[PDB]
Design an enzyme around this catalytic site. Structure first.
Site, PDB file in Angstrom:
ATOM      1  N   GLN A 164      -3.992   0.264  -1.213  1.00  0.00           N
ATOM      2  CA  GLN A 164      -3.713   0.702  -2.576  1.00  0.00           C
ATOM      3  C   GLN A 164      -3.365  -0.509  -3.414  1.00  0.00           C
ATOM      4  O   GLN A 164      -2.572  -1.359  -3.001  1.00  0.00           O
ATOM      5  CB  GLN A 164      -2.551   1.692  -2.607  1.00  0.00           C
ATOM      6  CG  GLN A 164      -2.831   3.001  -1.867  1.00  0.00           C
ATOM      7  CD  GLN A 164      -3.653   3.978  -2.688  1.00  0.00           C
ATOM      8  OE1 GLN A 164      -3.857   3.817  -3.896  1.00  0.00           O
ATOM      9  NE2 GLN A 164      -4.140   5.008  -2.022  1.00  0.00           N
ATOM     10  N   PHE A 165      -3.998  -0.607  -4.578  1.00  0.00           N
ATOM     11  CA  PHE A 165      -3.753  -1.648  -5.575  1.00  0.00           C
ATOM     12  C   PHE A 165      -4.304  -3.023  -5.229  1.00  0.00           C
ATOM     13  O   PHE A 165      -4.134  -3.939  -6.043  1.00  0.00           O
ATOM     14  CB  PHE A 165      -2.274  -1.761  -5.981  1.00  0.00           C
ATOM     15  CG  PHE A 165      -1.606  -0.419  -6.174  1.00  0.00           C
ATOM     16  CD1 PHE A 165      -2.116   0.483  -7.090  1.00  0.00           C
ATOM     17  CD2 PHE A 165      -0.514  -0.045  -5.400  1.00  0.00           C
ATOM     18  CE1 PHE A 165      -1.529   1.733  -7.272  1.00  0.00           C
ATOM     19  CE2 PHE A 165       0.079   1.201  -5.573  1.00  0.00           C
ATOM     20  CZ  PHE A 165      -0.440   2.091  -6.500  1.00  0.00           C
TER      21      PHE A 165
ATOM     22  N   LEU B  32      -5.764  -9.641   5.463  1.00  0.00           N
ATOM     23  CA  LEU B  32      -5.395  -8.520   6.314  1.00  0.00           C
ATOM     24  C   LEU B  32      -6.222  -7.272   6.054  1.00  0.00           C
ATOM     25  O   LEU B  32      -6.341  -6.432   6.952  1.00  0.00           O
ATOM     26  CB  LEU B  32      -3.923  -8.174   6.070  1.00  0.00           C
ATOM     27  CG  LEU B  32      -2.931  -9.197   6.616  1.00  0.00           C
ATOM     28  CD1 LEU B  32      -1.528  -8.829   6.211  1.00  0.00           C
ATOM     29  CD2 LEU B  32      -3.053  -9.306   8.126  1.00  0.00           C
TER      30      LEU B  32
ATOM     31  N   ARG C 275      -1.955   6.975   7.675  1.00  0.00           N
ATOM     32  CA  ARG C 275      -2.643   5.906   6.953  1.00  0.00           C
ATOM     33  C   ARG C 275      -1.747   5.201   5.947  1.00  0.00           C
ATOM     34  O   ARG C 275      -2.096   4.097   5.510  1.00  0.00           O
ATOM     35  CB  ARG C 275      -3.875   6.450   6.226  1.00  0.00           C
ATOM     36  CG  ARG C 275      -3.542   7.502   5.166  1.00  0.00           C
ATOM     37  CD  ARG C 275      -4.789   7.984   4.412  1.00  0.00           C
ATOM     38  NE  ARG C 275      -4.445   9.067   3.498  1.00  0.00           N
ATOM     39  CZ  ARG C 275      -4.255  10.322   3.873  1.00  0.00           C
ATOM     40  NH1 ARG C 275      -4.497  10.719   5.117  1.00  0.00           N
ATOM     41  NH2 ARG C 275      -3.804  11.203   2.981  1.00  0.00           N
ATOM     42  N   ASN C 276      -0.612   5.800   5.586  1.00  0.00           N
ATOM     43  CA  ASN C 276       0.320   5.233   4.619  1.00  0.00           C
ATOM     44  C   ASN C 276       1.641   4.793   5.244  1.00  0.00           C
ATOM     45  O   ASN C 276       2.636   4.610   4.526  1.00  0.00           O
ATOM     46  CB  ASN C 276       0.552   6.215   3.472  1.00  0.00           C
ATOM     47  CG  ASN C 276      -0.663   6.338   2.586  1.00  0.00           C
ATOM     48  OD1 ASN C 276      -1.392   5.362   2.377  1.00  0.00           O
ATOM     49  ND2 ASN C 276      -0.910   7.530   2.065  1.00  0.00           N
TER      50      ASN C 276
ATOM     51  N   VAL D  97      -6.070  -6.281  -2.382  1.00  0.00           N
ATOM     52  CA  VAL D  97      -6.185  -7.025  -1.128  1.00  0.00           C
ATOM     53  C   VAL D  97      -4.817  -7.501  -0.668  1.00  0.00           C
ATOM     54  O   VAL D  97      -3.970  -7.899  -1.484  1.00  0.00           O
ATOM     55  CB  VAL D  97      -7.120  -8.229  -1.350  1.00  0.00           C
ATOM     56  CG1 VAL D  97      -7.215  -9.101  -0.105  1.00  0.00           C
ATOM     57  CG2 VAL D  97      -8.508  -7.744  -1.749  1.00  0.00           C
ATOM     58  N   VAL D  98      -4.603  -7.490   0.650  1.00  0.00           N
ATOM     59  CA  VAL D  98      -3.362  -7.944   1.264  1.00  0.00           C
ATOM     60  C   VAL D  98      -3.674  -9.138   2.158  1.00  0.00           C
ATOM     61  O   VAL D  98      -4.655  -9.121   2.912  1.00  0.00           O
ATOM     62  CB  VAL D  98      -2.692  -6.825   2.086  1.00  0.00           C
ATOM     63  CG1 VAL D  98      -1.322  -7.273   2.591  1.00  0.00           C
ATOM     64  CG2 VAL D  98      -2.570  -5.541   1.258  1.00  0.00           C
TER      65      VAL D  98
ATOM     66  N   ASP E 114       7.082   2.172  -0.305  1.00  0.00           N
ATOM     67  CA  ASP E 114       7.175   3.123  -1.398  1.00  0.00           C
ATOM     68  C   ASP E 114       6.590   2.582  -2.694  1.00  0.00           C
ATOM     69  O   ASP E 114       6.705   3.244  -3.726  1.00  0.00           O
ATOM     70  CB  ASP E 114       8.609   3.629  -1.589  1.00  0.00           C
ATOM     71  CG  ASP E 114       9.605   2.514  -1.805  1.00  0.00           C
ATOM     72  OD1 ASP E 114       9.271   1.559  -2.525  1.00  0.00           O
ATOM     73  OD2 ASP E 114      10.739   2.603  -1.286  1.00  0.00           O
TER      74      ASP E 114
ATOM     75  N   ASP F  44       2.046  11.592  -0.517  1.00  0.00           N
ATOM     76  CA  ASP F  44       0.901  11.231   0.316  1.00  0.00           C
ATOM     77  C   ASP F  44       1.368  10.707   1.669  1.00  0.00           C
ATOM     78  O   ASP F  44       0.837   9.722   2.195  1.00  0.00           O
ATOM     79  CB  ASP F  44       0.002  10.234  -0.417  1.00  0.00           C
ATOM     80  CG  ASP F  44      -1.395  10.125   0.160  1.00  0.00           C
ATOM     81  OD1 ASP F  44      -1.812  10.920   1.014  1.00  0.00           O
ATOM     82  OD2 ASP F  44      -2.104   9.193  -0.289  1.00  0.00           O
TER      83      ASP F  44
ATOM     84  N   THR G  73       6.186  -8.852   0.217  1.00  0.00           N
ATOM     85  CA  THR G  73       7.030  -7.927   0.960  1.00  0.00           C
ATOM     86  C   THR G  73       7.177  -8.351   2.415  1.00  0.00           C
ATOM     87  O   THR G  73       6.485  -9.248   2.923  1.00  0.00           O
ATOM     88  CB  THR G  73       6.504  -6.476   0.931  1.00  0.00           C
ATOM     89  OG1 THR G  73       5.349  -6.370   1.781  1.00  0.00           O
ATOM     90  CG2 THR G  73       6.135  -6.030  -0.486  1.00  0.00           C
TER      91      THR G  73
ATOM     92  N   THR H 132      -7.650  -4.418   2.643  1.00  0.00           N
ATOM     93  CA  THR H 132      -7.446  -3.959   1.278  1.00  0.00           C
ATOM     94  C   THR H 132      -6.813  -2.579   1.337  1.00  0.00           C
ATOM     95  O   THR H 132      -7.175  -1.757   2.181  1.00  0.00           O
ATOM     96  CB  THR H 132      -8.775  -3.925   0.488  1.00  0.00           C
ATOM     97  OG1 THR H 132      -8.506  -3.708  -0.906  1.00  0.00           O
ATOM     98  CG2 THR H 132      -9.726  -2.863   1.017  1.00  0.00           C
TER      99      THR H 132
END
Ligand SMILES: *CCC(=O)N1CCC([C@@H]2CCNc3c(C(N)=O)c(-c4cc(OC)c(Br)c(OC)c4)nn32)CC1
Length: 264
Positions: free
Chosen positions: A18-19, A14, A131-132, A21-22, A145, A127, A80, A16
């Site tokens: 935060q933290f 999907l 984008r989040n 690759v998805v 979160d 933040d 998730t 990349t």
């Protein structure tokens, strides 16, 4: 909530975030899931577990739901709720949707509900921005979160040495003193509403990061997007009071949004 990796089928990548690759996957054959592979060196196993516990304990329909983790392995997986329409910023910029103004206010309501819940737990985001946020197949906007205190601010968003902040989403007391609070999340929510109603324009597009920081202190505010009625603009503008203590709470903002939704 440890998941057996044998119960996961990875389908495709999907992107990349935060933290790490998805990927889009299936869990137990029948459940769509997002699976993020925690980048080695981003956090230890114990730090990851503590971040996952924070996520599990925060439960709301407009927060992305944690399903489980895979920690007996490297890299660690976090699993998730799947958000098929991806990041809100990219979704807004996709013109094929032909957004009606009622849909845009519903997006603001979705995020406001999540933030009212986080506010009730004295949890700070720091933040909040399109984008989040994430969007599911039904068009519902939700906030993840996970690990917010460990987010990395990319070079695009910053203009400082040492203490960093997302310049175009930050109130004057953050820009000047790095003074984050519930009221800086309020400010950023107003900017998010502006991003929604502008279909993902960048805030303060005629100014550099450093110029924006200076000009905000000197009274610069975002103008009303064409798709936002004056009543909607009043709501986002209330988030931008110079004095932090004069900005509303998320409970007040939600009440205002529901009022405007009923009237419009
Ligand atoms: C606009 C920002 C951007 O380009 N991003 C951020 C989002 C990801 C990617 C898009 C598709 N869906 C998705 C999901 C999801 N849950 O469906 C996640 C995601 C996010 C987090 O924490 C931030 C965590 Br924890 C997940 O754990 C499985 C999953 N990220 N996306 C593309 C790049």
């Amino acid at each position: 909530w440890e998941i057996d990796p044998k119960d996961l089928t990875f389908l495709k990548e999907l992107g990349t975030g935060q933290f790490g690759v998805v990927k889009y996957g299936k869990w137990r054959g029948q459940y769509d899931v997002a699976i993020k592979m925690i980048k080695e060196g981003s956090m230890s196993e114990d730090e990851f577990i503590e971040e996952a516990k924070v996520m599990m304990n925060l439960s709301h329909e407009k927060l992305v739901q944690l399903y489980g983790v895979c920690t007996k392995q490297r890299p660690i997986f976090i699993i998730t709720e799947y958000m098929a329409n991806g990041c809100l910023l990219n979704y807004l910029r996709e013109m094929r949707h032909r957004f009606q103004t009622q849909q845009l206010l519903e997006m603001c309501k979705d995020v406001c509900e999540a933030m009212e819940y986080l506010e009730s737990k004295q949890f700070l985001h720091r933040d909040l921005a399109a984008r989040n946020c994430l969007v599911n197949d039904q068009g519902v906007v939700k906030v993840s979160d996970f690990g917010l205190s460990r987010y990395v601010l990319d070079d695009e968003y910053t203009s400082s040495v040492g203490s960093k902040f997302p310049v175009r989403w930050s109130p004057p007391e953050v820009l000047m003193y790095s003074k984050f609070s519930s009221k800086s999340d309020i400010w950023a929510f107003g900017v998010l509403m502006w991003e929604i109603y502008s279909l993902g324009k960048m805030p303060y597009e005629r100014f550099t990061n450093s110029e924006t920081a200076e000009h905000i202190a000197q009274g610069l505010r975002l103008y009303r997007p064409h798709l936002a009625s004056e009543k909607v603009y009043t709501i986002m503008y209330s988030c931008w009071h110079e004095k932090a203590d004069e900005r509303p709470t998320f409970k007040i903002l939600l009440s205002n949004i529901l009022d405007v939704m009923d009237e419009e």
